[PDB]
Design a protein around this ligand. Structure first.
Ligand SMILES: [K+]
Ligand SMILES: [K+]
Ligand SMILES: [K+]
Ligand SMILES: [K+]
Ligand SMILES: [K+]
Ligand SMILES: [K+]
Ligand SMILES: [K+]
Ligand SMILES: [K+]
Ligand SMILES: [K+]
Ligand SMILES: [K+]
Ligand SMILES: [K+]
Ligand SMILES: [K+]
Ligand SMILES: [K+]
Ligand SMILES: [K+]
Ligand SMILES: [K+]
Ligand SMILES: [K+]
Ligand SMILES: [K+]
Ligand SMILES: [K+]
Ligand SMILES: [K+]
Ligand SMILES: [K+]
Ligand SMILES: [K+]
Ligand SMILES: [K+]
Ligand SMILES: [K+]
Ligand SMILES: [K+]
Ligand SMILES: [K+]
Ligand SMILES: [Mg+2]
Ligand SMILES: [Mg+2]
Ligand SMILES: [Mg+2]
Ligand SMILES: [Mg+2]
Ligand SMILES: [Mg+2]
Ligand SMILES: [Mg+2]
Ligand SMILES: [Mg+2]
Ligand SMILES: [Mg+2]
Ligand SMILES: [Mg+2]
Ligand SMILES: [Mg+2]
Ligand SMILES: [Mg+2]
Ligand SMILES: [Mg+2]
Ligand SMILES: [Mg+2]
Ligand SMILES: [Mg+2]
Ligand SMILES: [Mg+2]
Ligand SMILES: [Mg+2]
Ligand SMILES: [Mg+2]
Ligand SMILES: [Mg+2]
Ligand SMILES: [Mg+2]
Ligand SMILES: [Mg+2]
Ligand SMILES: [Mg+2]
Ligand SMILES: [Mg+2]
Ligand SMILES: [Mg+2]
Ligand SMILES: [Mg+2]
Ligand SMILES: [Mg+2]
Ligand SMILES: [Mg+2]
Ligand SMILES: [Mg+2]
Ligand SMILES: [Mg+2]
Ligand SMILES: [Mg+2]
Ligand SMILES: [Mg+2]
Ligand SMILES: [Mg+2]
Ligand SMILES: [Mg+2]
Ligand SMILES: [Mg+2]
Ligand SMILES: [Mg+2]
Ligand SMILES: [Mg+2]
Ligand SMILES: [Mg+2]
Ligand SMILES: [Mg+2]
Ligand SMILES: [Mg+2]
Ligand SMILES: [Mg+2]
Ligand SMILES: [Mg+2]
Ligand SMILES: [Mg+2]
Ligand SMILES: [Mg+2]
Ligand SMILES: [Mg+2]
Ligand SMILES: [Mg+2]
Ligand SMILES: [Mg+2]
Ligand SMILES: [Mg+2]
Ligand SMILES: [Mg+2]
Ligand SMILES: [Mg+2]
Ligand SMILES: [Mg+2]
Ligand SMILES: [Mg+2]
Ligand SMILES: [Mg+2]
Ligand SMILES: [Mg+2]
Ligand SMILES: [Mg+2]
Ligand SMILES: [Mg+2]
Ligand SMILES: [Mg+2]
Ligand SMILES: [Mg+2]
Ligand SMILES: [Mg+2]
Ligand SMILES: [Mg+2]
Ligand SMILES: [Mg+2]
Ligand SMILES: [Mg+2]
Ligand SMILES: [Mg+2]
Ligand SMILES: [Mg+2]
Ligand SMILES: [Mg+2]
Ligand SMILES: [Mg+2]
Ligand SMILES: [Mg+2]
Ligand SMILES: [Mg+2]
Ligand SMILES: [Mg+2]
Ligand SMILES: [Mg+2]
Ligand SMILES: [Mg+2]
Ligand SMILES: [Mg+2]
Ligand SMILES: [Mg+2]
Ligand SMILES: [Mg+2]
Ligand SMILES: [Mg+2]
Ligand SMILES: [Mg+2]
Ligand SMILES: [Mg+2]
Ligand SMILES: [Mg+2]
Ligand SMILES: [Mg+2]
Ligand SMILES: [Mg+2]
Ligand SMILES: [Mg+2]
Lengths: 49, 64, 80
RNA sequence: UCAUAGGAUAUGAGAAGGCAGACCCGGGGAACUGAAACAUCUAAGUACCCGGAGGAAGAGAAAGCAAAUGCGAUUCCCUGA
RNA sequence: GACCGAUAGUGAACCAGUACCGUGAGGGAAAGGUGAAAAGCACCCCGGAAGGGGAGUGAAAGAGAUCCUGAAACCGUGUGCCUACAAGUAGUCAGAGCCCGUUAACGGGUGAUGGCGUGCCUUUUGUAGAAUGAACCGGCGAGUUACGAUCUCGUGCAAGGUUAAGCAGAAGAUGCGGAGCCGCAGCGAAAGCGAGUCUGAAUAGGGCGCAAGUACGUGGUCGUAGACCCGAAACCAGGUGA
RNA sequence: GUGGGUAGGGGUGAAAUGCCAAUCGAACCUGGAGAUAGCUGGUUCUCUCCGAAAUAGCUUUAGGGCUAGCCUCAAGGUAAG
RNA sequence: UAUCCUUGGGAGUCAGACUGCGAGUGAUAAGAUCCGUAGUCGAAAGGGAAACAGCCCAGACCGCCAGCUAAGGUCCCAAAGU
RNA sequence: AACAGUGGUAGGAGAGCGUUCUAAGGGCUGUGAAGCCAGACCGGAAGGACUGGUGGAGCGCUUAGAAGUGAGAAUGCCGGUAUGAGUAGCGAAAGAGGGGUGAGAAUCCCCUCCACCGAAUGCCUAAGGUUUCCUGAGGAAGGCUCGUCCGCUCAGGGUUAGU
RNA sequence: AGGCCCAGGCGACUGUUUAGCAAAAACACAGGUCUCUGCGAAGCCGUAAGGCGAAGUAUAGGGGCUGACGCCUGCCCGGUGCUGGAAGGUUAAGAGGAGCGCUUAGCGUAAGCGAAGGUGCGAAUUGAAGCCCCAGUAAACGGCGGCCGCGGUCCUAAGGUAGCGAAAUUCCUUGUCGGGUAAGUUCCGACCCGCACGAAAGGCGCAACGAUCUGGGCACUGUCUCAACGAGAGACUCGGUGAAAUUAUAGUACCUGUGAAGAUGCAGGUUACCCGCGACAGGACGGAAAGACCCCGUGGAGCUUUACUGCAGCCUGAUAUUGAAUGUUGGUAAUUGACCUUCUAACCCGCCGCCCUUAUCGGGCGGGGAGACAGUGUCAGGUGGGCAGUUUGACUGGGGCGGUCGCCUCCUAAAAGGUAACGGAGGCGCCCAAAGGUUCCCUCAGAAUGGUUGGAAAUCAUUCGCAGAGUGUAAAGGCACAAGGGAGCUUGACUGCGAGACCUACAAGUCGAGCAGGGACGAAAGUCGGGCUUAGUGAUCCGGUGGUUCCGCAUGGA
C-alpha cells in the first residue's frame, strides 16, 4: 500500500499465460555424468536411484 | 497459516536468476498516437523493479 | 469577503545548464549542456541534439571555449 | 340409494418432553468489519433462529479418476499448494 | 503437567449462580489458614456487659476465635536535636552548636545560618506551567503465542540437504517411513531451446543469465490471526418489557 | 379503581419526535464481540556505544501513509570521501 | 584530515521554533506568513544577558576545599580596579 | 602500554541485573527456612551480602533451560486508609414537672396539667407486605442523639365460618 | 370568600400538549371544501389465513387541506400532479427463425469446398401497461412581470382583483404626521416607497372566551427613594452523633517585571512574630462534566429529495393451472396459430337450503352466481424516499462561500542546479500532407527621394538600413556561415535497435553517436528516425480491431 498512490503492481500490465501442458525436465550436465564409470548405461532410473 | 501470494503481483512480475524482479512497462495499453516511436520501442522492452519498490513488495512474492 | 488570484501557475523546472565540468573526462554520449537554442555551440567531437542538448561524440576531456567574439562552444578532445 | 364423512368402543412399553452451552446433517440466515470511502466483493453460509438425529453423523460400492504394458466404493491424515 | 496457588486458578477452594440488583429477560459479588491435639483459658480480681489484669493449658496465648505470617498508607504515646522577625517545589552544597556511638568508617542523629534551586508524567516549536494525569498506600494491570515468510548468527551434512502423515516406542528420545519440499540452470508470454536464451531478417546490437545450498535452533522484522493494552458513538441477530 | 389489548425497521400519539418501567431522532437484555477507532490515553529493570527528523515526491492527501532524504547494525570494497 | 561507496537487517521522522543575513506576501506591521542561507533550540546541562528553549560564551564519563581562561565583569548586594 | 574519545529525545546496537518455574550437580535449614523489621556494609548501575529482632518450615548456590519476568502515571481495576473536620447535617410539629424502673434516663413506664389533628393525624377495608401481631427476656448491631425502649435480637405463643 | 377599568395583536369558544426548563399564537374542535370508495368498498394490519372498516353501505366510510360565526375567496392549466384520451412515435419477457459461425460423412495432388446431425449465436415480423403526445383540472403541487413616455413596448402560463398594510410580515427605521407622557426606539390611529401582505399553507372583520402576548389608567402598596425594628428556622456556644465533593508534595504574602505572551511558588524589591475562631468571596485561569459552539475523522445516527443503487407494494404482458363449441382471419401440407362470441366441467363465491352439528369456523351434498376470466406460481416491463444500504473531494492565514486542481514559459529564485505562498504575468488540451525531408538559391522591418489611378499606408526604382523583421502558436532562450524567405524532387512524420548520458522516490520523462534493413534528396561529401527549441496529454483493469512459426484441459479441431 502506497497511501492511496496507485500501487506499483496495479500501474504495470499483466503479462503472459501459464501453459497447461508445460514440460520441465530434470537437467543433467556432463560434469554429473563423470561420476559414473565407463561402460555404465546411464538410465533415468539409475540417475534417480 | 501459510502466507498468501499477492496474486495481482504474481501476474505482473517474475524472478530473474540473481533474484531481481522482471516487469513490463506502463503506458503500453493504448493512446499510441500520443507517444513517439522511440518511446514505444523502449516501453515495449522489459524492465527491473527498482530497489525502493523491491523493499516494499519483496515479501508479497515470497512463495514464487 | 475576499477575491481571488488569476495566477498561481508554473511549469516544472527543466534542470538546464552544464552537466560536465571543463577538464572532466567524459564517455561518448555524455550530455555536456542542456539548453533552449544555442547558448553554447557544439565544438569538436560534440553533437547538438534535437532539443539543443550538447553531447560528447567521443571519449575525451571536456573543454568550454570562446567561439569568436560573442559566442561560446564546448569541445571534447581525445586523451593522449 | 348403496355408501362415504362423522360417531362409538377395544388393543398399543406408538408419539409428545428433556438435554452435553460439545460433535453431525438439513431449513432459514445477518451485520459490524475488510476493501484504508462504497454499492459487486468481504466478513460468511459465520453468528443466530428452526427442524432432525446418532453414538457418532454425513459419505459410500463408479453414468468415477484419468490418459498408463492404467486405477478400482467411501471417509480421514500427509502432500500437491 | 518447566499449569494456578486465594486480587491467582472456575463466576464459585467457603452452603454461589447464593447474597444483592432488575417488572422481566438478565446482571452478579465478597468471603480460605487457632493449635500436633481443644488441651477452646477452672479459679481470683475491676466491670451491668463488652473488655481487660492475673492464674492455668500449650513449644508458643504478642497462636484466645474473619485466632499462621502480619508490609505500606493512616492513627497514636514517649522524647534526643531544632523551632514564635519568618517569604519556604522543601532539597542540595557549606556549616557551627547540641546529642549519640557504628557492618569503624577522612562515623550517626539534629540543624542556627550562608549559597544554589519553579515537583513527576504526558504532550509539545516551546510547559514551573494559569495544558494533561495521579488523594495516599498496597496488590493487579500492556509487543504474546501459533502457523507461514525473510535476514543475521549457530550447528550438521554439502552439489546436495531434508523427510511429512503414519507404524513401533514413556504422551519421550529414537528407529522405520523418500511420498513430498528446496537447491544443483538459465532464458522466453509460450512452443521451446539450453550455458545460454529472448528480441530481431541478422554470425548485429541490447535484456536477463553463464563465466552453496539445505535441515534444524536462538535472535531481529514482516504476514495471517483481537496481534502491545484500555476506550466509542453505532450496526446486526435472537429474546424480555404496556 | 380493577381486569385486559397493541412491542421496537414496532407500538401509541387532540402531534411535543411526545410517550413505551427515573432509558427514546428509534426501549431493554444477551449474543455476533476482544466490532472498528489513520483518534486520545497508557506501555513496568540498568548501564554503555552510536544518534536523527520535523524535508521532497505522490496520495479523497493534508495531525495518516508510502518511496526517497537523514539514524543505526553487519558484511564487503578498500582509501574512493 | 578520515571519511566515502556498495549490499543486506532494524528504525524513527513527514506540527518545527527563534536569531542573523537574502527575498516574496503584509503596511519594507506582527513573537505574522512563506521560501533561501548559517547558527542555536528541538535532543544541550554549565557561565553571561536580573528572571528569560531559540541571543553572547561554551558542549556535562566520574571525583578534588588545585590552576588558567571565555562571554561578561571588578563601589555594596556580588567574585575581581573606588 | 600509548593515543584518542565518552551531552542526548525519536530510534538502532551491545553488555548486564533481578523475578517464578524446570534439569543436573552441590548445599543450607527446628542448633531456626521463606517472609517481615532495622542497621553506619559491598558492587559502575540494575542490585547483592552480613548482623540483630520477628517468624515458625522451608530455601539458596552453580551451570543451562523456559517465561503470566520487573509499574509511578492509563479521569486504569480491586482493597485499605486519609484530607476536607469534630466541619455540613441529624428529614415540617409542644411540652413541662412529679413519681417509677435501672449500672446508667431530656429520650422507657405511670400520673398531672398543657398542646396538636378532627371530610382527619379518627374508625373500617383493598392492593401490597408476610409474622411486622401478643407475652416474657435482651441491648452487640439497626434506630441519624440516647435508650432500661422499639416495627430491632432471643424464646414461646396467637389467625376457629353452611351464612 | 372577585381587584377593577380602557385599548390593541393572536387564537372563535370548553378542551389538548413537550412526565422532569416551552401551556402557547402550537394541537384539537364544530363548520367548510376537495378527493377516493357500489361493498370480498376504498383505506388499513398481516407472507397468508384472519381481521379492523362495519354486524356500517354514498345523508356511509377512508384520506388531504382549511378551521366558530359574518362578508368573501380574483387571475394563470405553460410546468408538475391527478383524471381522461384520438391519431402519430417509442418500448420487455415470450413468440418467430431469414441468415451466419464451429464440427465433418463425403470430396479434393494440396490449398480449399462441404451433405446430414449436433452445437453456438441470431435479423425481419409480432409483443402490454408505461412514456412521448393530446384534452381537462388550482379549497391540486404551484405561479400571480420588466422597461419607457392612462398609452407604448418587451416578456410571460398569466402578470396580485377585493380586502388589508412600517404588520407575530417593513431591511432602510426610532419612516412621516397625529394621539397619549414633563419627557414614549414600546403602544394606539392614520399615511403607503408592501426590502419581502393578499384571498381555504385562506383574506378581511368579529360579540363571547384566555394562568395568551402588548400599551395605558384607577386602587394599592417596602418594588423603589432608603432603609429601620420585631418573631421564628438555620448560622453562633455547649453536650451527643457525624458525612461529602476535592486533594502531586507544600513551611502556600505584596508590587513591578519575567516566562507557553494573565505567577503563592521565577527575578528584583517591598512587607510579614507563632496558633486559632466568626465573617467575605478577589485569586488559586477554583470544583463539577475528556466543550454542546467551532474545526477535524475518507466516525456515526435521524431526516429529505428530480443524488446513486436497490427492495416492498401497486400496475401491466407472456406462460402454467386451462377445457369444449361456433364464427372470422393468418401461416405451413389437412393440421396448427391469431382473435371474436358462446358454452360448462376445472378454478372462485365474505350467496341460499340441507347434513356432519347444541357451530356466523371448516367440510360434504344440492341450488344459484361467476367462469377458463379471476386467483395463485414462474418470467418480464413500468411505477415506486413507502422502505433499505450508501455517496455527497481536497487545498484554504478557522470553516463555509468564492477561487484553484494536470501540462508549458517567464519573474520572484539570493550569477550551477533546485527552491515556497489563495506571490507577480501569460499560454496548452493543438496545428501543418507542408508549416516535414533534402538539394540549390536568397535576405528582413522601417525610412528617405521620385512616381497616372494612389492617399499616411497597395505596386515599382534608387540609396540608407544588425535585424529596429521573421520564426504556425504563450513566453524565454536561440537564429542573418540563418533556425528567417523562395524553388525543384520527395515521404526518414522510416523498421529493428542502441555504447553512453541527463532527469528522477517510484512510475514515467529527455538526449544520443553508432550498427543493420530498405529508402529520399544530392555530382559527391553528406543530411534525414517530423516541425528553431521547450506545452498540445492520462497508469492499470476491462473491451474492440488487425497481425501471429505461441498455448489449446484425452486426441483432432474449436
Ligand atoms: K457490508
Ligand atoms: K477503512
Ligand atoms: K471472583
Ligand atoms: K516524634
Ligand atoms: K538551604
Ligand atoms: K483545561
Ligand atoms: K545475449
Ligand atoms: K550451514
Ligand atoms: K525468524
Ligand atoms: K504482532
Ligand atoms: K429499535
Ligand atoms: K412514534
Ligand atoms: K427497565
Ligand atoms: K540501512
Ligand atoms: K531564517
Ligand atoms: K529471618
Ligand atoms: K493509578
Ligand atoms: K378542613
Ligand atoms: K425491651
Ligand atoms: K401542540
Ligand atoms: K413603560
Ligand atoms: K502554559
Ligand atoms: K474567593
Ligand atoms: K488567521
Ligand atoms: K522543400
Ligand atoms: Mg495492446
Ligand atoms: Mg521554468
Ligand atoms: Mg523534435
Ligand atoms: Mg470500508
Ligand atoms: Mg448409529
Ligand atoms: Mg441412541
Ligand atoms: Mg450413516
Ligand atoms: Mg494471601
Ligand atoms: Mg476467585
Ligand atoms: Mg426481586
Ligand atoms: Mg508474634
Ligand atoms: Mg504452622
Ligand atoms: Mg495473625
Ligand atoms: Mg527567633
Ligand atoms: Mg525586622
Ligand atoms: Mg500549542
Ligand atoms: Mg498553580
Ligand atoms: Mg488533552
Ligand atoms: Mg486530577
Ligand atoms: Mg496506585
Ligand atoms: Mg439498518
Ligand atoms: Mg410481552
Ligand atoms: Mg399487562
Ligand atoms: Mg421514561
Ligand atoms: Mg465479528
Ligand atoms: Mg522509509
Ligand atoms: Mg520551515
Ligand atoms: Mg513565526
Ligand atoms: Mg542553495
Ligand atoms: Mg518533539
Ligand atoms: Mg547540535
Ligand atoms: Mg544560559
Ligand atoms: Mg542566572
Ligand atoms: Mg525543557
Ligand atoms: Mg586569572
Ligand atoms: Mg567583592
Ligand atoms: Mg554519546
Ligand atoms: Mg562531553
Ligand atoms: Mg534494540
Ligand atoms: Mg518462593
Ligand atoms: Mg538474617
Ligand atoms: Mg507482568
Ligand atoms: Mg466545634
Ligand atoms: Mg470549614
Ligand atoms: Mg460553621
Ligand atoms: Mg449545624
Ligand atoms: Mg426529626
Ligand atoms: Mg385545634
Ligand atoms: Mg409489638
Ligand atoms: Mg444509638
Ligand atoms: Mg384557544
Ligand atoms: Mg416540560
Ligand atoms: Mg411549564
Ligand atoms: Mg381478505
Ligand atoms: Mg368484519
Ligand atoms: Mg390551520
Ligand atoms: Mg384561490
Ligand atoms: Mg395542458
Ligand atoms: Mg409609565
Ligand atoms: Mg401569508
Ligand atoms: Mg391558498
Ligand atoms: Mg387562519
Ligand atoms: Mg382553556
Ligand atoms: Mg457540636
Ligand atoms: Mg522556561
Ligand atoms: Mg513577556
Ligand atoms: Mg505577571
Ligand atoms: Mg520573589
Ligand atoms: Mg474550572
Ligand atoms: Mg474534548
Ligand atoms: Mg434514505
Ligand atoms: Mg456498512
Ligand atoms: Mg477541508
Ligand atoms: Mg478562509
Ligand atoms: Mg466552492
Ligand atoms: Mg545561487
Ligand atoms: Mg539558478
Ligand atoms: Mg480496477
Ligand atoms: Mg483438446
Amino acid at each position: 500500500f502506497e497511501g492511496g498512490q496507485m500501487p506499483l503492481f496495479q500501474r504495470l500490465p499483466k503479462r503472459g499465460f501459464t501453459n497447461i501442458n508445460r514440460k520441465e525436465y530434470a537437467v543433467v550436465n556432463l560434469d554429473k555424468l563423470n561420476g559414473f564409470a565407463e561402460g555404465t548405461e546411464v538410465t533415468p532410473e539409475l540417475l534417480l536411484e | 497459516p501459510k502466507m498468501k501470494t499477492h496474486r495481482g503481483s504474481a501476474k505482473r512480475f517474475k524472478k530473474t536468476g540473481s533474484g531481481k524482479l522482471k516487469r513490463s512497462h506502463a503506458y503500453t495499453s493504448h493512446l499510441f498516437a500520443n507517444k513517439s516511436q522511440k518511446q514505444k520501442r523502449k516501453l515495449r522492452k522489459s524492465a527491473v523493479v527498482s530497489a525502493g519498490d523491491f523493499k516494499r513488495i519483496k515479501q508479497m512474492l515470497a512463495n514464487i | 469577503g475576499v477575491g481571488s488570484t488569476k495566477n498561481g501557475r508554473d511549469s516544472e523546472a527543466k534542470r538546464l545548464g552544464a552537466k560536465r565540468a571543463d577538464g572532466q573526462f567524459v564517455t561518448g554520449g555524455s550530455i555536456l549542456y542542456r539548453q533552449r537554442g544555442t547558448k553554447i555551440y557544439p565544438g569538436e567531437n560534440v553533437g547538438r541534439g534535437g532539443d539543443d542538448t550538447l553531447f560528447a561524440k567521443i571519449d575525451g576531456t571536456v573543454k568550454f571555449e570562446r567561439f569568436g567574439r560573442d559566442r561560446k562552444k564546448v569541445s571534447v578532445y581525445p586523451v593522449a
